[PDB]
CSV table of N, CA and C in Angstrom, one decimal:
chain,number,residue,atom,x,y,z
G,1,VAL,N,95.3,95.0,101.1
G,1,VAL,CA,96.4,94.3,100.4
G,1,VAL,C,97.3,93.6,101.4
G,2,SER,N,98.1,92.7,100.9
G,2,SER,CA,99.3,92.1,101.6
G,2,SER,C,100.2,91.6,100.6
G,3,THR,N,101.5,91.3,101.0
G,3,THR,CA,102.5,90.9,100.1
G,3,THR,C,103.3,89.7,100.6
G,4,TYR,N,103.8,88.9,99.7
G,4,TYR,CA,104.4,87.6,100.0
G,4,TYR,C,105.5,87.2,99.1
G,5,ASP,N,106.6,86.8,99.7
G,5,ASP,CA,107.8,86.3,98.9
G,5,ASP,C,107.8,84.8,98.7
G,6,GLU,N,108.0,84.4,97.5
G,6,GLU,CA,108.2,83.0,97.1
G,6,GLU,C,109.6,83.0,96.6
G,7,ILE,N,110.3,81.8,96.8
G,7,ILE,CA,111.6,81.6,96.3
G,7,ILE,C,111.8,80.1,95.7
G,8,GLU,N,112.8,79.9,94.9
G,8,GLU,CA,113.2,78.6,94.3
G,8,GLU,C,114.1,77.9,95.1
G,9,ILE,N,114.0,76.6,95.2
G,9,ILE,CA,114.9,75.8,96.0
G,9,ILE,C,116.4,76.0,95.7
G,10,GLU,N,116.7,76.0,94.4
G,10,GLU,CA,118.1,76.3,93.8
G,10,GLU,C,118.7,77.5,94.5
G,11,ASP,N,117.9,78.5,94.9
G,11,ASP,CA,118.5,79.8,95.3
G,11,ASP,C,118.9,79.7,96.8
G,12,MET,N,118.7,78.6,97.4
G,12,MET,CA,119.0,78.5,98.8
G,12,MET,C,120.3,77.8,98.9
G,13,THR,N,120.9,77.9,100.1
G,13,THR,CA,122.1,77.1,100.4
G,13,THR,C,121.6,76.0,101.2
G,14,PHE,N,122.2,74.8,100.9
G,14,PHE,CA,121.9,73.6,101.7
G,14,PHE,C,123.2,73.4,102.6
G,15,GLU,N,123.0,73.0,103.8
G,15,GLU,CA,124.1,72.7,104.7
G,15,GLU,C,124.0,71.3,105.1
G,16,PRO,N,124.7,70.4,104.5
G,16,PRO,CA,124.6,68.9,104.6
G,16,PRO,C,124.8,68.4,106.0
G,17,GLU,N,125.7,69.0,106.8
G,17,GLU,CA,125.8,68.6,108.2
G,17,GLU,C,124.5,68.8,109.0
G,18,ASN,N,123.7,69.8,108.6
G,18,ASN,CA,122.5,70.2,109.3
G,18,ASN,C,121.2,69.8,108.6
G,19,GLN,N,121.3,69.2,107.4
G,19,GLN,CA,120.1,68.9,106.6
G,19,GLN,C,119.1,70.1,106.5
G,20,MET,N,119.7,71.3,106.2
G,20,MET,CA,118.9,72.5,106.3
G,20,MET,C,119.2,73.5,105.2
G,21,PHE,N,118.2,74.1,104.7
G,21,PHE,CA,118.3,75.1,103.6
G,21,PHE,C,118.2,76.5,104.3
G,22,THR,N,119.1,77.4,103.9
G,22,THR,CA,119.1,78.7,104.4
G,22,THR,C,119.0,79.7,103.3
G,23,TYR,N,118.7,80.9,103.6
G,23,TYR,CA,118.6,82.0,102.7
G,23,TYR,C,118.9,83.3,103.4
G,24,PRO,N,119.6,84.3,102.8
G,24,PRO,CA,119.9,85.6,103.5
G,24,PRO,C,118.5,86.2,103.9
G,25,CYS,N,118.5,86.5,105.2
G,25,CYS,CA,117.3,87.2,105.8
G,25,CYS,C,117.5,88.6,106.2
G,26,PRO,N,116.7,89.5,105.6
G,26,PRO,CA,117.0,91.0,105.8
G,26,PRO,C,116.7,91.5,107.2
G,27,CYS,N,117.2,90.7,108.2
G,27,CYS,CA,117.3,91.0,109.6
G,27,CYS,C,118.7,90.4,109.9
G,28,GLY,N,118.9,90.1,111.2
G,28,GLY,CA,120.3,89.6,111.5
G,28,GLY,C,120.4,88.1,111.2
G,29,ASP,N,119.4,87.5,110.7
G,29,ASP,CA,119.3,86.1,110.8
G,29,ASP,C,119.2,85.4,109.4
G,30,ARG,N,118.9,84.2,109.4
G,30,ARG,CA,118.7,83.5,108.2
G,30,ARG,C,117.3,82.8,108.1
G,31,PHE,N,116.7,82.9,106.9
G,31,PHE,CA,115.5,82.0,106.6
G,31,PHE,C,116.0,80.5,106.7
G,32,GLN,N,115.2,79.7,107.3
G,32,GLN,CA,115.6,78.3,107.5
G,32,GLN,C,114.5,77.3,107.4
G,33,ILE,N,114.8,76.1,106.8
G,33,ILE,CA,113.9,75.1,106.5
G,33,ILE,C,114.6,73.8,106.4
G,34,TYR,N,114.0,72.8,106.9
G,34,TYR,CA,114.6,71.5,107.1
G,34,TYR,C,114.2,70.5,106.0
G,35,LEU,N,115.2,69.7,105.6
G,35,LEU,CA,115.0,68.7,104.6
G,35,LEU,C,113.8,67.7,105.0
G,36,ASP,N,113.7,67.3,106.2
G,36,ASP,CA,112.8,66.2,106.5
G,36,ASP,C,111.3,66.7,106.4
G,37,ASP,N,111.2,68.0,106.8
G,37,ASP,CA,109.9,68.6,106.7
G,37,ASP,C,109.4,68.9,105.2
G,38,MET,N,110.3,69.3,104.4
G,38,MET,CA,110.0,69.5,103.0
G,38,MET,C,109.6,68.2,102.3
G,39,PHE,N,110.2,67.1,102.6
G,39,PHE,CA,109.7,65.8,102.1
G,39,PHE,C,108.3,65.6,102.4
G,40,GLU,N,107.9,66.0,103.6
G,40,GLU,CA,106.5,65.8,104.0
G,40,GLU,C,105.5,66.7,103.4
G,41,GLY,N,105.9,67.8,102.8
G,41,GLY,CA,105.0,68.9,102.3
G,41,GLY,C,105.3,70.3,102.6
G,42,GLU,N,105.9,70.6,103.9
G,42,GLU,CA,106.3,71.9,104.3
G,42,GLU,C,107.0,72.7,103.3
G,43,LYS,N,106.4,73.9,103.0
G,43,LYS,CA,107.0,74.7,101.9
G,43,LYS,C,107.4,76.1,102.4
G,44,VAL,N,107.4,76.3,103.7
G,44,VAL,CA,107.5,77.6,104.3
G,44,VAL,C,108.8,77.7,105.1
G,45,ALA,N,109.7,78.6,104.6
G,45,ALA,CA,110.9,79.0,105.4
G,45,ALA,C,110.6,80.2,106.3
G,46,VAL,N,111.1,80.1,107.5
G,46,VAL,CA,110.9,81.0,108.6
G,46,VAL,C,112.2,81.7,109.0
G,47,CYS,N,112.2,83.1,109.0
G,47,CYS,CA,113.2,83.8,109.6
G,47,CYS,C,112.9,84.4,111.0
G,48,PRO,N,113.4,83.8,112.1
G,48,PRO,CA,113.2,84.1,113.5
G,48,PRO,C,114.2,85.1,114.2
G,49,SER,N,114.9,86.0,113.5
G,49,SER,CA,115.5,87.1,114.2
G,49,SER,C,114.5,88.3,114.2
G,50,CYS,N,113.5,88.1,113.4
G,50,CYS,CA,112.3,88.9,113.4
G,50,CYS,C,111.3,87.8,113.2
G,51,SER,N,110.1,88.1,112.7
G,51,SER,CA,109.4,87.0,112.0
G,51,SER,C,109.2,87.6,110.6
G,52,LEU,N,109.3,86.7,109.7
G,52,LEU,CA,109.1,86.9,108.3
G,52,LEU,C,109.1,85.5,107.7
G,53,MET,N,108.5,85.3,106.6
G,53,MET,CA,108.2,84.0,106.1
G,53,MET,C,108.2,83.9,104.6
G,54,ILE,N,109.0,82.9,104.1
G,54,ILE,CA,109.1,82.8,102.6
G,54,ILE,C,108.7,81.4,102.2
G,55,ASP,N,108.1,81.3,101.0
G,55,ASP,CA,107.5,80.1,100.4
G,55,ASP,C,108.6,79.5,99.5
G,56,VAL,N,109.0,78.3,99.7
G,56,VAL,CA,110.0,77.6,98.9
G,56,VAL,C,109.4,76.7,97.8
G,57,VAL,N,109.6,76.9,96.5
G,57,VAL,CA,109.1,76.1,95.5
G,57,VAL,C,110.1,75.0,95.2
G,58,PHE,N,109.6,73.7,95.3
G,58,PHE,CA,110.4,72.5,95.0
G,58,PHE,C,109.4,71.4,94.8
G,59,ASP,N,109.9,70.3,94.1
G,59,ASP,CA,109.2,69.0,94.1
G,59,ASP,C,110.2,68.0,94.7
G,60,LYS,N,109.7,66.8,94.9
G,60,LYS,CA,110.5,65.7,95.5
G,60,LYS,C,111.8,65.4,94.7
G,61,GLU,N,111.8,65.5,93.4
G,61,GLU,CA,113.0,65.1,92.6
G,61,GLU,C,114.1,66.2,92.8
G,62,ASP,N,113.7,67.4,93.1
G,62,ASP,CA,114.7,68.4,93.4
G,62,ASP,C,115.3,68.1,94.8
G,63,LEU,N,114.7,67.2,95.6
G,63,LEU,CA,115.3,66.8,96.8
G,63,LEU,C,116.3,65.6,96.8
G,64,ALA,N,116.1,64.7,95.8
G,64,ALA,CA,117.2,63.6,95.6
G,64,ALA,C,118.6,64.1,95.9
G,65,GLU,N,119.1,65.1,95.2
G,65,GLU,CA,120.5,65.5,95.4
G,65,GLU,C,121.0,65.9,96.8
G,66,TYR,N,120.1,66.4,97.7
G,66,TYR,CA,120.5,67.0,98.9
G,66,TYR,C,120.5,65.9,99.9
G,67,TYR,N,119.6,64.9,99.8
G,67,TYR,CA,119.7,63.6,100.5
G,67,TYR,C,121.1,63.0,100.3
G,68,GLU,N,121.7,63.2,99.1
G,68,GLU,CA,122.9,62.5,98.8
G,68,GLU,C,124.1,63.3,99.4
G,69,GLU,N,124.2,64.6,99.2
G,69,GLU,CA,125.1,65.4,100.0
G,69,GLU,C,125.1,65.2,101.5
G,70,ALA,N,123.9,65.0,102.1
G,70,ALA,CA,123.7,64.7,103.5
G,70,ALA,C,124.2,63.3,103.9
G,71,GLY,N,124.3,62.4,103.0
G,71,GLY,CA,124.7,61.1,103.5
G,71,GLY,C,123.5,60.2,103.9
G,72,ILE,N,122.3,60.6,103.5
G,72,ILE,CA,121.1,59.8,103.9
G,72,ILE,C,120.2,59.5,102.8
G,73,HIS,N,119.1,58.8,103.1
G,73,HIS,CA,118.2,58.4,102.0
G,73,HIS,C,116.8,58.9,102.4
G,74,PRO,N,116.0,59.1,101.4
G,74,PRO,CA,114.6,59.5,101.7
G,74,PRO,C,113.8,58.4,102.3
G,75,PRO,N,112.8,58.8,103.2
G,75,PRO,CA,111.8,57.8,103.8
G,75,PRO,C,111.1,56.9,102.8
G,76,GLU,N,110.9,57.4,101.6
G,76,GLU,CA,110.4,56.6,100.5
G,76,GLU,C,111.2,56.9,99.2
G,77,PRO,N,111.5,56.0,98.3
G,77,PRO,CA,112.3,56.3,97.1
G,77,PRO,C,111.7,57.4,96.3
G,78,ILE,N,112.5,58.2,95.6
G,78,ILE,CA,112.1,59.3,94.7
G,78,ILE,C,112.3,58.9,93.2
């Protein structure tokens, strides 16, 4: 057996200055994943105070709003 966490994009915090989604990580650190990577397909958030790894569920249209908060535009329109 093995076990794996999946989470919804809504549940994460976005930090517009950093273009980054974070989530509370049950170590000293935070799960982290970048906006530009997610646009390309990347769905895995990494917590590097340990290693642990969580799957983020989103589609492109869930990304429109955070482009806007960041002050930028997507590489291709959504």
